[PDB]
RNA sequence: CAGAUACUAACAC
RNA sequence: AAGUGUAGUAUCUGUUCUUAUCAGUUUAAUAUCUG
């Protein structure tokens, strides 16, 4: 292994197809941004001088000047712990061949990047855009959030630079972003949305409100969309173009605390959960995806996926890949 | 009946959930990876995550009704 | 003994059913999905779903119905207002405005 | 040193440091400790605290680092380097000890 | 101090799940929430019926048990020897019956009421 | 070896479970239990789940031998189809108005709990917060 | 009624009549996990007596495979008292 | 509540 | 002429109770019991 240092815990990355650069999102709770760390240090230095009244102020000024210049490396001494609900987050474009940072965007204090995508939009054809889903002021326990944003950058100079385009507000954390049929799907808390690019904001063109809890991930093949719920495992959604509708057509019959998902084939999903299990769920043959009187089955969808594989790995799995 | 965790016809909401929460925190303290998950998510030391879980064991759902 | 067994000593009342008295636990439970209740349903403009089973009182059926309507309306997707368009220069507009 | 799941002192004068996350370390204990020594016997005011200055390593010398991938948070198997054998791109670590690590089957 | 059915119906996210007896629970709001959960199974309908379970299934002539087709075609139904065919019945011809989905409980009246798959076995 | 023969006997067991006679139901429940304990770890969940649909309605049986057999089948099925299923069957009856339903359901729940306390942590349904009480397990909702 | 106290290092025994039988469920099929009993059950005059019925004990008592699979071997001392 | 009959537990002798 | 005992179920037989108008004990509800 070759190791390329990063500043915060990397949540996800994606590979830009035309240059092989990695767009990495890194995010820590209990953390200061560089800007905030600088500001905090400045006021600490000022307060350190203001603490002195006599000729001791000369020594206090020397100590403050020393303190402002001391720079103990975070990788050795630990990053300073900001309070509860404090976030630091960056978007990094690094070359994988040798880990030089091509570009580094630092997000505002208490913005936490949770999802990232790279895609083209059919309305503009050729340009590549990085969409980053951010929570604002997220409090982990108890859970509470001041909404979120999806930042859009165009990715330029043959995949090397993030030109900020616009920032689109959303009501809850955009936890998953998935390029889809020349637009993008976004999982905004429990809501699944189709967004087009626009100019000043991403434009909501379709939505489904029927996912149980928070969307933890999205995968797609063709007209099919596989949604990971944080707890209610896998929901199969079909997008219909002409009607402009997202229809739930199948779901799992077990709670799974999904952490990651890989599509094996057009009917089959491998899942991992928080409890160290892998499973494979398959739509049974002749499952139909072309779909107060309706109740569904067992308070879920009318058709059920069948668990064809279960295995306790023993360790929490955060990635799966057919390769 | 003798086994702590068992219920019966007169088990309240509060009693059952306090069982679920104390049982969850013990599972978290044992499953090293689930503890790993929480420590990374909170950006916190494992030792502090365990300590916080032990603190929460005392009254995990707020006071009895 | 059969009179007490079939619970015919009890006598439930339903306003939606024009204050009919079924006289039975089972009778009552079946009636909600039968003709008289459904007529009252038609008269009040409420569909006779499982939501209104065991509901006997007009003000309740009406208010519960209203609640259900709003819930379903806010659970659905309304592209006429809920789709976003840009008119020019990134000004966001409705589907009807576009 | 990095935050440790366990520390163990070897009789041979080494400190093993099993890191909570990331790589583990074996340090030779060069010295057993001008630095101020704090005590329970010292008078200290209500709400006050002893203070010390962190600095670079002084009693410990790094002798070995055990490359560990915990925690892996996001992995991607791809041939980004055109080597006709894909490399595993893993986003590891936590906090400022995070890294992207490229894994390739073979000996170094 | 209980809710009316009317009251409970408005206090919950899924009124249709509310039954008449629910308001007489210790915790009706928890009960209705639990009934609304994904994949939970209802209590057997007959808990409140006076007749014991399956005891009204009387007064009706029913034919003897229909053998599965692979056993039927073994011919032992006519015999009452060919051990190779007897093996092939279970190990070649055995076909899975119409198995019921999770949560679809039985009761007295129920009876008479690229597209290629991944990781498939290669042909023998 | 039962895995080879489970599907063939499943219809016969289903017929016995549907039978009015208590002994047919009692004996079929015994079969169920043994066959579930023998096929543990070999797939075949689909057949066992289908048979659970037939067995579960018998939880309100009062006959001592029949109830013991049904309980034994359920304990076996807990191993074979998992504590998650068993919990899903028991959820709606735990806080049911009738004490008779609750008594049976808590008895079944207790067997699952003693048998699979650790496993149940993953399977417990989300209970929403009260005004004075916090019931949501927030850590399990953390996203990494 | 089973003793159900903490199982010790003492090994359970079966008389000739009760041999082959699983202590918990009377099955003659697939003995699997060796039975352990509490000290008090092994003590004095009770040394080497049958777990099921208190007879002279000639063979080692076992939980069967099913009882092992169900973790019924874990409940504690299964001497019937 | 009593009588007759059938049955269950590899029940025991 | 392969008998008897222990523990427990099920099914025919012969018994299955008019009440005003409310309360209480109860129960999921009824019934039961007490005014
Ligand atoms: Zn009516
Ligand atoms: Zn003996
Ligand atoms: Zn046994």
Curated annotation (Swiss-Prot), chain A:
Residues the UniProt record annotates as site (Interaction with SF3B1): 213
Region feature (Interaction with SF3B1 and SF3B5): 11-29
Residues the UniProt record annotates as site (Interaction with SF3B5): 141
Top-level division of the source organism's lineage: Eukaryota
Record region (Interaction with SF3B1): 253-274
Localization annotation: Nucleus
Reported function: Component of the 17S U2 SnRNP complex of the spliceosome, a large ribonucleoprotein complex that removes introns from transcribed pre-mRNAs. The 17S U2 SnRNP complex (1) directly participates in early spliceosome assembly and (2) mediates recognition of the intron branch site during pre-mRNA splicing by promoting the selection of the pre-mRNA branch-site adenosine, the nucleophile for the first step of splicing.
Entry's family note: Belongs to the RSE1 family.
Complexes and interactors: Component of the 17S U2 SnRNP complex, a ribonucleoprotein complex that contains small nuclear RNA (snRNA) U2 and a number of specific proteins. Part of the SF3B subcomplex of the 17S U2 SnRNP complex. SF3B associates with the splicing subcomplex SF3A and a 12S RNA unit to form the U2 small nuclear ribonucleoproteins complex (U2 snRNP). Within the SF3B subcomplex, interacts directly with SF3B1 (via HEAT domain), SF3B5 and PHF5A. Identified in the spliceosome A complex; remains associated with the spliceosome throughout the splicing process. Component of the spliceosome B complex.
Domain notes: The core of the protein consists of three beta-propeller domains.
Protein name: Splicing factor 3B subunit 3
Species: Homo sapiens (Human)
Gene this protein is translated from: SF3B3
Residues of the full protein shown: 776 to 1107 of 1217
Curated annotation (Swiss-Prot), chain C:
Residue intervals of every Matrin-type zinc finger in the record: 12-43
Tissues where this protein is expressed: Ubiquitous.
Modification Phosphothreonine, positions: 81
Annotated compartments: Nucleus speckle; Nucleus
Stated role: Component of the 17S U2 SnRNP complex of the spliceosome, a large ribonucleoprotein complex that removes introns from transcribed pre-mRNAs. The 17S U2 SnRNP complex (1) directly participates in early spliceosome assembly and (2) mediates recognition of the intron branch site during pre-mRNA splicing by promoting the selection of the pre-mRNA branch-site adenosine, the nucleophile for the first step of splicing.
Family as reported in the entry's similarity comment: Belongs to the SF3A3 family.
The protein's assembly and partners: Component of the 17S U2 SnRNP complex, a ribonucleoprotein complex that contains small nuclear RNA (snRNA) U2 and a number of specific proteins. Part of the SF3A subcomplex of the 17S U2 SnRNP complex which is composed of three subunits; SF3A3/SAP61, SF3A2/SAP62 and SF3A1/SAP114. SF3A associates with the splicing factor SF3B and a 12S RNA unit to form the mature 17S U2 small nuclear ribonucleoprotein complex (17S U2 snRNP). Identified in the spliceosome 'E' complex, a precursor of the spliceosome 'A' complex. Identified in the spliceosome 'A' and 'B' complexes.
Protein name according to UniProt: Splicing factor 3A subunit 3
Lineage of producing organism: Eukaryota, Metazoa, Chordata, Craniata, Vertebrata
Whole-protein coverage range: 395 to 492 of 501
UniProtKB/Swiss-Prot annotation, chain E:
Superkingdom of the organism of origin: Eukaryota
Annotated gene: SF3B2
Chain positions with Omega-N-methylarginine modification: 51, 58
Entry comment on modification after translation: Methylation at Arg-51 by PRMT9 is required for the interaction with SMN1.
Protein's name according to its UniProt entry: Splicing factor 3B subunit 2
Quaternary structure (record): Component of the 17S U2 SnRNP complex, a ribonucleoprotein complex that contains small nuclear RNA (snRNA) U2 and a number of specific proteins. Part of the SF3B subcomplex of the 17S U2 SnRNP complex. SF3B associates with the splicing subcomplex SF3A and a 12S RNA unit to form the U2 small nuclear ribonucleoproteins complex (U2 snRNP). Within the SF3B complex, interacts directly with SF3B4. Found in a complex with PRMT9, SF3B2 and SF3B4. Interacts (Arg-508-methylated form) with SMN1 (via Tudor domain). Interacts with RBM7. Interacts with ERCC6. Component of the minor spliceosome. (Microbial infection) Interacts with HIV-1 Vpr.
Effect of residue 73 to K: Does not affect methylation by PRMT9
Function text: Component of the 17S U2 SnRNP complex of the spliceosome, a large ribonucleoprotein complex that removes introns from transcribed pre-mRNAs. The 17S U2 SnRNP complex (1) directly participates in early spliceosome assembly and (2) mediates recognition of the intron branch site during pre-mRNA splicing by promoting the selection of the pre-mRNA branch-site adenosine, the nucleophile for the first step of splicing.
Subcellular location: Nucleus; Nucleus speckle
Cross-link (Glycyl lysine isopeptide (Lys-Gly) (interchain with G-Cter in SUMO2)): 35
Modified residues (Symmetric dimethylarginine): 51
From Swiss-Prot, chain G:
Keyword Phosphoprotein annotated: yes
Site positions per UniProt: Interaction with SF3B3: 9
Keyword entries, A-Z: Acetylation, Activator, DNA-binding, Metal-binding, mRNA processing, mRNA splicing, Nucleus, Phosphoprotein, RNA-binding, Spliceosome, Transcription, Transcription regulation, Zinc
Region (Interaction with SF3B1 and SF3B3): 27-43
Region annotation Interaction with SF3B3: where it falls in the sequence: 71-74
Record note on what altering residue 28 to E/S/A does: Alters the structure of the presumed branchpoint (BP) adenosine binding pocket within the splicing factor SF3B complex which may lead to decreased binding affinity and thus affect pre-mRNA splicing
Origin: domain of life: Eukaryota
GO cellular component: a single term: U2-type spliceosomal complex
Positions that bind Zn(2+) 3: 22, 25, 64, 67
Main location: nucleus
Transmembrane domains' residue ranges: none
Sequence similarity: Belongs to the PHF5 family.
Subunit and interaction comment: Component of the 17S U2 SnRNP complex, a ribonucleoprotein complex that contains small nuclear RNA (snRNA) U2 and a number of specific proteins. Part of the SF3B subcomplex of the 17S U2 SnRNP complex. SF3B associates with the splicing subcomplex SF3A and a 12S RNA unit to form the U2 small nuclear ribonucleoproteins complex (U2 snRNP). Within the SF3B complex interacts directly with SF3B1 and SF3B3. Component of the minor spliceosome, which splices U12-type introns. Within this complex, interacts with CRIPT. Interacts (via N-terminus) with U2AF1 and SRSF5; acts to bridge the two.
Name the record gives this protein: PHD finger-like domain-containing protein 5A
């Amino acid at each position: 292994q070759v190791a390329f240092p990063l500043q915060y815990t990397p949540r996800k990355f994606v590979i830009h197809p035309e240059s092989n650069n990695l767009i990495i999102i890194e995010t820590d709770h209990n953390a200061y941004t560089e800007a905030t760390k600088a500001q905090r240090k400045q006021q600490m230095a000022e307060e350190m001088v203001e603490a002195a009244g006599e000729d001791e102020r000369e020594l206090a000024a020397e100590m403050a000047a020393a303190f402002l210049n001391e720079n103990l490396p975070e990788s050795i001494f630990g990053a300073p712990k900001a309070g509860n609900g404090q976030w630091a987050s960056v978007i990094r474009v690094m070359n994988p061949i040798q880990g030089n940072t091509l570009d580094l965007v630092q997000l505002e204090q208490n913005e936490a990047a949770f999802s990232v995508a790279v895609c083209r939009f059919s309305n503009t054809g050729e340009d590549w855009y990085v969409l980053v889903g951010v929570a604002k002021d997220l409090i982990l326990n108890p859970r509470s959030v001041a909404g979120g944003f999806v930042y859009t950058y165009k990715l330029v100079n043959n995949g090397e630079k993030l030109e900020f385009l616009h920032k689109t507000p959303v009501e809850e954390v955009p936890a998953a972003i998935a390029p889809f049929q020349g637009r993008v799907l976004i999982g905004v808390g429990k809501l699944l949305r189709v967004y087009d690019l626009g100019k000043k904001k991403l434009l909501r063109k379709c939505e489904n409100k029927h996912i149980a809890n928070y969307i933890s991930g999205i995968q797609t093949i063709g007209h099919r969309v596989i949604v990971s719920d944080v707890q209610e495992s896998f929901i199969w959604v079909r997008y219909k173009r002409n009607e402009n509708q997202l229809i739930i057509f199948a779901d799992d019959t077990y709670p799974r605390w999904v952490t990651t998902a890989s599509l094996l084939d057009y009917d089959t999903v491998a899942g991992a959960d928080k409890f160290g299990n892998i499973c494979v769920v398959r739509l049974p043959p002749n499952t139909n995806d072309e779909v107060l009187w309706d109740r569904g089955l067992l308070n879920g969808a009318s058709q059920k996926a069948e668990v064809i594989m279960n295995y306790h790995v023993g360790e929490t799995v955060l990635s799966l890949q057919k390769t | 009946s003798k086994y702590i965790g068992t219920g019966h016809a007169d088990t309240t909401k509060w009693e059952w959930l306090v069982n679920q929460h104390r049982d969850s925190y013990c599972s978290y303290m044992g499953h090293f990876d689930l503890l790993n998950y929480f420590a990374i998510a909170e950006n916190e030391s494992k030792a502090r995550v365990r300590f916080n879980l032990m603190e929460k064991m005392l009254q995990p759902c707020g006071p009895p009704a | 003994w059969l009179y007490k067994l079939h619970g015919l000593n009890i006598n439930y009342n339903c306003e939606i059913c024009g204050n009919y008295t079924y006289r039975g636990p089972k009778a009552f439970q079946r009636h909600f999905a039968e003709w008289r209740h459904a007529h009252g349903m038609r008269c009040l403009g409420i569909p006779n779903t499982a939501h209104f089973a065991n509901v006997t009182q007009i003000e309740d059926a009406v208010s519960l119905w209203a609640k259900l309507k709003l819930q379903k309306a806010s659970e659905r997707w309304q592209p006429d207002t809920e789709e976003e368009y840009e008119d020019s220069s990134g000004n966001v507009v409705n589907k009807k405005t576009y | 040193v990095p935050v440790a799941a366990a520390m163990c002192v070897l009789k041979t004068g080494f400190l093993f440091v099993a890191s909570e996350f990331g790589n583990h370390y074996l340090y030779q204990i060069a010295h057993l400790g001008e630095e101020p020594e704090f005590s329970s016997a010292m008078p200290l005011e209500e709400g006050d605290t002893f203070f010390f200055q962190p600095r670079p390593l002084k009693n410990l010398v790094l002798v070995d680092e055990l490359d560990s991938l915990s925690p892996i948070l996001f992995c991607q198997i791809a041939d980004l380097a055109n080597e006709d054998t894909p490399q595993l791109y893993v986003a590891c670590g936590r906090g400022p000890r995070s890294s992207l690590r490229v894994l390739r089957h073979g000996l170094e | 101090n209980r809710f009316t059915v009317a009251e409970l119906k408005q206090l919950v996210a899924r009124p249709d799940v509310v039954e008449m007896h629910d308001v007489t629970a210790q915790d009706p709001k928890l009960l209705v929430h639990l009934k609304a959960t994904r994949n939970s199974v209802p209590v057997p309908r007959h808990w409140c019926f006076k007749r014991k379970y399956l005891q009204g299934k009387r007064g009706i002539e029913k034919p003897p048990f229909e053998l599965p087709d692979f056993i039927k075609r073994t011919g032992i139904q006519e015999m009452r020897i060919d051990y190779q065919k007897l093996h092939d019945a279970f190990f070649k011809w055995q076909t899975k019956p119409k198995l019921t989905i999770h949560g679809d409980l039985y009761y007295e009246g129920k009876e008479f009421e690229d597209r290629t798959p991944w990781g498939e076995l290669e042909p023998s | 070896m039962g895995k080879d023969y489970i599907y063939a006997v499943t219809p016969l067991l289903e017929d016995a479970l549907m039978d009015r006679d208590l002994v047919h139901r009692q004996t079929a429940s015994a079969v169920v239990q043994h066959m579930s304990l023998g096929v543990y770890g070999f797939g075949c969940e689909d057949s066992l789940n289908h048979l659970l649909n037939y067995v579960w309605p018998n939880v309100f049986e009062t006959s001592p031998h029949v109830i013991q057999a049904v309980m034994g089948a359920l304990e076996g099925l807990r191993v074979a189809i998992g504590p998650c299923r068993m919990l899903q069957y028991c959820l709606q009856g735990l806080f049911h108005p009738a004490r008779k339903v609750r008594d049976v359901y808590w008895k079944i729940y207790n067997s699952i709990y003693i048998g699979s306390q650790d496993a149940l942590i993953a399977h417990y349904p989300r209970i929403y917060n009260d005004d004075k009480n916090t019931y949501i397990r927030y850590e399990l909702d953390y996203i990494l | 009624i089973f003793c159900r106290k903490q199982a010790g290092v003492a090994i359970g025994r079966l008389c000739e009549k009760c041999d082959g039988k699983c202590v918990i469920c009377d099955s003659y099929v697939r003995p699997c996990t060796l039975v352990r009993i509490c000290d008090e059950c092994n003590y004095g005059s009770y040394q080497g007596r049958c777990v099921i019925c208190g007879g002279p004990g000639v063979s080692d008592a076992y939980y069967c495979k099913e009882c092992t699979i169900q973790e019924k071997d874990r409940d504690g001392c299964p001497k019937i008292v």
